[PDB]
């Protein structure tokens, strides 16, 4: 049935260790990443409470999102004042500690936080004049909720459109006009700028 | 009574050789089919979470490890059963064309009905450790594996800042 | 109780076989 | 009497005739398929004549 | 009740007859435009030996020995002629009913019955079922069916696409290992990180001798790479026309998939099989003279779009001295013939596109629609000249694939409509295509693509919008 | 209250998917060679086998032989359905189905054996008494397992594996055979003057080497009079050219539906409607009533009733009611006998066209149950502001189906008549059984 690799637990670690032999380096480092990714599932196990089973993804911890808000709108406030540095700085924490958190949560919280933070950071990057960056960031946010979200797409098309390459910022406005109303005149007005 | 006994001698020797034919035959057939190369690629956190009930018996371990290596386990086989629900219907779809040949439809059969038992003894096994612990667990699964998907797809998208600033400082 | 369309043609060419067999032990069993 | 027969030409005389290519490809096909039955059964009747004149005796 | 003739007077009569009237007939039975280029590349002779070598049939070993053995019969049957109230008789030899030979015969036809029956049986039962409709055997298909993914375009493609069985059949033997090394340092060091990025990775990873050989071919092979073994070129042209059936068959296995992405992949891959380019650079390279070189004095020194051969043509007389300057770049007599080969390719631009239903006014739901598409073959049961590109053994019919989608979600609406014809540089068209009506109520917004292999750079994509109501 | 049978019958498995063309042909074909190759051996405990045939004019019709495995291979088919139908309709579910399915075979079974018993019994073989007491139930199981092979092989034909039933094939194999077996027949008949060749081109090819004169061997080969020559070869060549082009007539009426707007479409109404039933329904009724003829006239010798229905001669008809209905042997004996000719024409063209007016009711394919049906569907009249489609049908049909007998008929007459070979009943139900098929593979996958 199962194939038996020989481990090794370590005292004091908790963290699993697959001492030598599957005659092959491919499966060595396969079990290898394996055993890394088993290590973090423990440490997330054992932070999450004194029992080890996880909660049901229903009922959902204010606590992160309240931080998360405040965060975002002490960011936005201080961006607000004219300064960018601080501002993108406050974001890519926000960010991080976003992303950081576990992933048994639903994943539309997460999702939907990482949209917005996404979209004020690409923002504030058209705001300092640097283009890739805040294009690729438009783009990650666009990526992360397509639907009922228009000013990724028009950050994107203007970043594009500021940066050149006429033929990638039509396709952008082509499909986000197909999937798609303030959205839908800015569109068509970052269209006629061809 | 020779004259009695030839006829039903002769539908006796008739049937036992059909008989036998057809037991012959479908002993073959079964062993053929039951040696068709698996679909897909071997259980890899199984064969990690049996190996550590092995070490565990042969020997301390703590009880925490071993549910996250079943987490981790019903994280892969919810990937796994996603793909087979989204293969089927157009596996279903194709046979009809007969652009595709017809082992392949007996592979997708056996390969569900060994998921199914798969899935059945992960939720048994989960039921096993913590009180009424069936659930929650392919909810975290599918939770989990979304979320890990979406996580590497973001880091993806992101690893390449760096080429675009360089591309933008070389046109500038 | 099912069986596969191969057990038929076989038990056909079986029985066809067989009524040779018959015969040819007949001329076998008259002949000496 | 005859007007069953003046009926049946007028339901002649509007029906649609076939044309040549389509005859000749309908009539291939059923030859071929006749022929096909005719030869099996003449071969196999004509290789059980002598088997069957040496089994029965 | 027979009385067989044993003197040979009359069996030869009937024999004779038979084989003739077999004889006869089987010795009786067995006694589109090209376009204009001047142009030959390097290596001709290989690709002009696999042009002939693909197709072959003798269709004479089968009836030269049958009517041979028919003639002699017939004339020993004749020398046997030549030689020379109420009762029936055979005419059969007597020797086929003596005690002799009565239990050989009687044995030889129980063997024939018992064996050749089910083996030949068996034999066309087992080999008319490997091959599937696309002309691919079956193992290939099932083999590059699991490889399918959600969206994967242009580089997975060819991955998923060089794990068929044809490459087993191939190179099998010792063939495998010869040129191994050679081809692969070429193909994974001259080839830059914008044609390959994990690419490399992917085939890094894949451990047996024939894929990774067939992959590393297949690259050599779409990127022009002319490895110098004269041995191997023969086996790397044969590979891409191998490709090419592949790719029908992988088009074939994403059509039944429902998703958009990789339809417009399938057809990208065969459109660069088909030619010699590479998926993921300009377009530029279909004109016959045309390197690296040229393409990166032409379109910038650095840029991320392709200029194609629209806009390239059209630009005014400054290519003259942007592109055949003479210091190794083209030469007069070499541009003169690119341009005068360049204004012959087909490119369709359609004018309208409207919906209609067959005898009616305005469109009822559920019914039959037939959708009319006018457009106009202007360069930059009519046959279109066959494919330009001479860098594979086989000549390709340009085939053209009209289909229609939607954005809100990326899935096809209805299958394609594949032709290879028109109805006659320029005139008008037409072309038609019919499906069935969305039953419910309420308009629709659809885009139809004019998708064609054979050619890269010549797409349509125009939004139609479709009516329903009562 | 049939339950417990259900499952102790064998019964072929269902197909796992749809299958695909050639392999349906395949198995087709081989079904066709197995039944072939099984009618044509002969069966054990024959000993006495030179006596009159009971039964002779039922062998064309249930395409079975005498003195061999297939004694009565088709006739279980037959009689299971025949009378499962009427006791159906005198008087569902699957569970009831499957149920009536088991009864149907069981009842298949059982008259297969009784009628095997009751033809050993009766004297066929020879006398039981001096038979052998062991080798008459040799003979029953010999036949019994034969006749159940054939109900299986049909049963595996008809689930899904063949493109068509198993009646058509096994009734149209035969007349092939008696019809190309008749044209290169080794079979050499000596009458004196020296033996002669019984099939046609190799009696014209003897006669044409062996005889003095090239002018006589032809002016034999032609019209010969007394065994089968070239000239009827060209007669029912001629016959089968005529009714594969008169098939052909159809009468396409305008239709276009009305549920889903614009599709057009057409339904047929051929002038050969209801194909072969008015034919193989009429030569039913002739071979009834000649066996009941032939069984009377053998038992009650002398009567004046008997004699009147028929007498016989050394057998053939002749001087009586089955001497009408029996068909002119060749052109010689419709020359003598005008009164007879006469009869026999009126009577076929009768019975054919009032037969299938007959059948047309019975079959359900009536103008008052069609029009409905397609009323159903959605279809309505294409004309131009012509909407009746019940009209237009009633008018169409009687006249095709009245006219379509009588046609046929008249084909049959001509073709029996001319002196075509085999009977001209044999000859139709071979054409338009191969004509169905070959449309029915048309239909399917090329
Ligand atoms: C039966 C259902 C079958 C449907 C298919 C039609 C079958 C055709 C009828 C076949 C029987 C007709 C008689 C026959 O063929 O043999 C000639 C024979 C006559 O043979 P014979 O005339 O050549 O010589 C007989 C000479 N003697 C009498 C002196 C020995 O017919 C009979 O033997 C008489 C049969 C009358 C009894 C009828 C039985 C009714 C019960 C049916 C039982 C069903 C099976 C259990
Ligand atoms: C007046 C005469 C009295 C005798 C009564 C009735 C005789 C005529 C019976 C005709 C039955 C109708 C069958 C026509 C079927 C046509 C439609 C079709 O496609 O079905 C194909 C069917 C198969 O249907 P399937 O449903 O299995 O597929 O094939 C046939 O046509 C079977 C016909 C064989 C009937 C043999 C005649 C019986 C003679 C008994 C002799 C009695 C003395």
């Known amino acids: 049935t199962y194939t038996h690799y020989p481990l090794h637990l370590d005292p004091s670690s908790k963290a699993v260790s697959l001492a030598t032999t599957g005659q092959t380096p491919a499966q060595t480092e396969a079990v290898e990443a394996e055993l890394q990714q088993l290590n973090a599932l423990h440490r997330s196990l054992i932070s999450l409470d004194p029992p080890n089973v996880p909660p049901p993804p229903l009922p959902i911890n204010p606590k992160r999102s309240a931080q998360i808000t405040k965060l975002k709108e002490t960011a936005n406030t201080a961006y607000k004042r004219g300064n960018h540095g601080e501002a993108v700085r406050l974001y890519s924490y926000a960010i991080e500690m976003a992303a950081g958190r576990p992933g048994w949560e639903p994943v539309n919280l997460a999702r939907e936080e990482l949209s917005g933070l996404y979209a004020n950071r690409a923002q504030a990057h058209m705001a300092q004049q640097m283009w890739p960056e805040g294009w690729v960031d438009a783009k990650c946010s666009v990526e992360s909720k397509p639907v009922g979200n228009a000013k990724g797409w028009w950050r994107g098309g203007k970043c594009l459109v500021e940066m050149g390459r006429y033929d990638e910022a039509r396709a952008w406005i082509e499909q986000a006009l197909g999937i798609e109303s303030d959205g839908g005149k800015e569109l068509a007005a970052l269209l006629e700028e061809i | 009574w020779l004259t009695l006994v030839v006829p039903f001698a002769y539908l006796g020797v008739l049937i036992g050789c059909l008989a036998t034919f057809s037991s012959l035959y479908r002993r073959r057939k079964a062993a053929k089919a039951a040696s068709l190369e698996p679909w897909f690629p071997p259980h890899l956190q199984r064969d990690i979470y049996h190996s550590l009930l092995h070490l565990d018996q042969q020997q301390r371990v703590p009880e925490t490890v071993l549910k996250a290596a079943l987490l981790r386990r019903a994280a892969e086989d919810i990937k796994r059963v996603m793909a087979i629900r989204e293969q089927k219907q157009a596996l279903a779809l194709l046979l009809q064309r007969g652009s595709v040949g017809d082992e392949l439809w007996q592979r997708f059969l056996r390969a569900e009905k060994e998921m199914e038992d798969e899935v059945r003894d992960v939720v048994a096994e989960a039921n096993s450790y913590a009180p009424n612990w069936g659930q929650v667990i392919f909810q975290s699964a599918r939770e989990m594996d979304a979320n890990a998907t979406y996580r590497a797809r973001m880091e993806e998208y992101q690893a390449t800042v760096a080429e675009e600033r360089a591309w933008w400082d070389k046109k500038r | ?32 | 009497p005859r007007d069953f027969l003046k009926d049946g030409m007028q339901f002649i005389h509007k029906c649609q005739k076939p044309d040549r290519k389509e005859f000749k490809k309908v009539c291939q096909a059923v030859a071929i398929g006749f022929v096909a039955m005719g030869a099996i059964g003449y071969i196999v009747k004509l290789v059980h004549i002598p088997i069957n004149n040496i089994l029965v005796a | 009740e027979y009385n067989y003739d044993e003197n040979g007077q009359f069996f030869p009569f009937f024999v004779l007859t038979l084989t003739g009237l077999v004889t006869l007939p089987l010795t009786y039975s067995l006694l589109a435009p090209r376009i204009k280029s001047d142009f030959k590349p390097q290596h001709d002779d290989i690709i002009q030996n696999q042009k002939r070598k693909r197709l072959r049939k003798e269709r004479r070993v089968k009836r030269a020995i049958a009517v041979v053995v028919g003639w002699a019969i017939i004339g020993y049957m004749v020398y046997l002629i030549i030689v020379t109230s109420y009762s029936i008789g055979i005419a059969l030899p007597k020797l086929i009913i003596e005690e002799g030979s009565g239990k050989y015969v009687l044995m030889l036809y129980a063997s024939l019955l018992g064996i050749l029956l089910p083996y030949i049986v068996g034999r066309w039962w087992y080999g008319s079922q490997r091959y599937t409709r696309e002309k691919v055997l079956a193992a290939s298909a099932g083999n590059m069916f699991r490889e399918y993914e959600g969206t994967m375009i242009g580089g997975p493609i060819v991955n998923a696409l060089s794990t068929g069985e044809e490459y087993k059949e191939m190179l099998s033997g010792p063939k495998a290992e010869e040129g191994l090394a050679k081809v692969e340092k070429k193909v994974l060091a001259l080839d830059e990180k914008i044609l390959s990025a994990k690419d490399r990775e992917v085939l890094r990873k894949i451990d047996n001798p024939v894929r990774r050989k067939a992959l590393a071919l297949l690259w050599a092979y779409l990127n022009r790479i002319d490895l110098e073994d004269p041995v191997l070129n023969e086996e790397k042209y044969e590979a891409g026309s191998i490709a090419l059936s592949l790719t029908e068959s992988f088009t074939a296995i994403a059509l039944a998939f429902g998703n958009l992405i990789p339809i417009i992949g399938a057809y990208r891959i065969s459109q660069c099989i088909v030619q010699a380019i590479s998926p993921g650079s300009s377009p530029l390279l279909q004109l016959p003279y045309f390197t690296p070189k040229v393409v990166e004095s032409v379109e910038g020194a650095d840029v991320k779009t392709h200029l194609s051969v629209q806009k390239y043509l059209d630009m005014p007389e400054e290519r003259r001295r942007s592109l055949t300057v003479g210091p190794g770049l083209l030469t007069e007599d070499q541009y003169n013939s690119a341009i005068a080969v360049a204004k012959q390719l087909p490119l369709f631009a359609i004018s309208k596109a409207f919906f209609k239903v067959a005898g009616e006014r305005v469109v009822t739901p559920s019914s039959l629609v037939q959708l009319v598409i006018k457009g106009r073959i202007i360069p930059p049961r009519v046959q279109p000249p066959l494919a330009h590109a001479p860098y594979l053994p086989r000549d390709h019919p340009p085939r053209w694939h009209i289909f229609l989608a939607d954005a809100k979600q990326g899935k096809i609406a209805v299958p394609p409509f594949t032709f290879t014809t028109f109805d006659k540089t320029f005139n008008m068209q037409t072309l038609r295509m019919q499906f069935q009506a969305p039953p419910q109520v309420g308009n629709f917004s659809f885009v139809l693509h004019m998708i064609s292999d054979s050619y890269m750079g010549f797409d349509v994509k125009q939004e139609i919008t479709l009516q329903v109501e009562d | 209250l049939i339950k417990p049978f259900t499952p102790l019958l064998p019964e072929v498995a269902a197909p796992e998917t749809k299958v695909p063309f050639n392999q349906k042909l395949m198995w087709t074909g081989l079904t066709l060679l197995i039944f072939l190759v099984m009618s044509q051996m002969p069966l054990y405990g024959i000993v006495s086998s030179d006596t009159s045939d009971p039964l002779y004019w039922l062998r064309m019709m249930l395409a079975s032989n005498r003195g061999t495995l297939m004694e009565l291979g088709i006739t279980p088919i037959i009689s299971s359905g025949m009378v499962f139908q009427l006791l159906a309709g005198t008087h569902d579910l699957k569970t009831d189905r499957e149920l009536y399915q088991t009864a149907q075979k069981l009842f298949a079974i059982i008259l297969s054996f009784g009628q095997a018993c009751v033809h050993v019994l009766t004297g066929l073989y020879g006398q039981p008494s001096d038979l052998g007491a062991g080798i008459c139930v040799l003979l029953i199981v010999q036949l019994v397992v034969a006749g159940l092979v054939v109900i299986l092989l049909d049963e595996l034909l008809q689930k899904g594996y063949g493109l068509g039933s198993g009646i058509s094939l096994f009734i149209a194999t035969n007349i092939c055979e008696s019809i190309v077996w008749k044209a290169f027949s080794p079979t050499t008949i000596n009458t004196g003057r020296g033996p002669e060749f019984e099939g046609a081109i190799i009696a014209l090819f003897h006669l044409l080497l062996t005889w003095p004169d090239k002018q006589r061997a032809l002016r034999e080969a032609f019209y010969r009079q007394s065994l089968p020559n070239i000239m009827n070869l060209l007669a029912t060549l001629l016959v089968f050219a005529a009714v594969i082009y008169l098939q052909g007539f159809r009468v396409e009426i305008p239709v276009k539906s009305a549920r889903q707007r614009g599709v057009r479409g057409s339904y047929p109404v051929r002038l050969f409607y209801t194909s072969n039933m008015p034919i193989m329904l009429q030569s039913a009724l002739c071979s009834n009533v000649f066996l009941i003829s032939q069984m009377l006239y053998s038992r009650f010798s002398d009567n004046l009733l008997v004699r009147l229905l028929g007498v016989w001669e050394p057998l053939h008809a002749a001087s009586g009611i089955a001497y009408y209905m029996s068909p002119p042997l060749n052109f010689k004996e419709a020359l003598l006998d005008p009164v007879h000719t006469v009869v026999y024409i009126t009577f076929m063209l009768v019975a054919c066209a009032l037969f299938s007016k007959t059948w047309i009711e019975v079959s359900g394919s009536s103008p008052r149950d069609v029009a409905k049906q397609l009323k159903d569907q959605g279809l309505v009249m294409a004309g131009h502001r012509e909407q009746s489609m019940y009209k237009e049908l009633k008018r169409v049909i009687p006249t095709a189906a009245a006219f379509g007998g009588a046609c046929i008929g008249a084909l049959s007459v001509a073709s029996d008549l001319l002196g075509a070979l085999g009977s001209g009943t044999g000859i139709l139900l071979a054409v338009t059984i191969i004509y169905g098929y070959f449309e029915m593979a048309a239909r399917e996958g090329d």
């Open chain 3, 1 to 32: 109780l099912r069986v596969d369309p191969v057990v038929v043609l076989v038990l056909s060419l079986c029985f066809i076989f067989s009524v040779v067999g018959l015969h040819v032990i007949a001329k076998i069993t008259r002949k000496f």
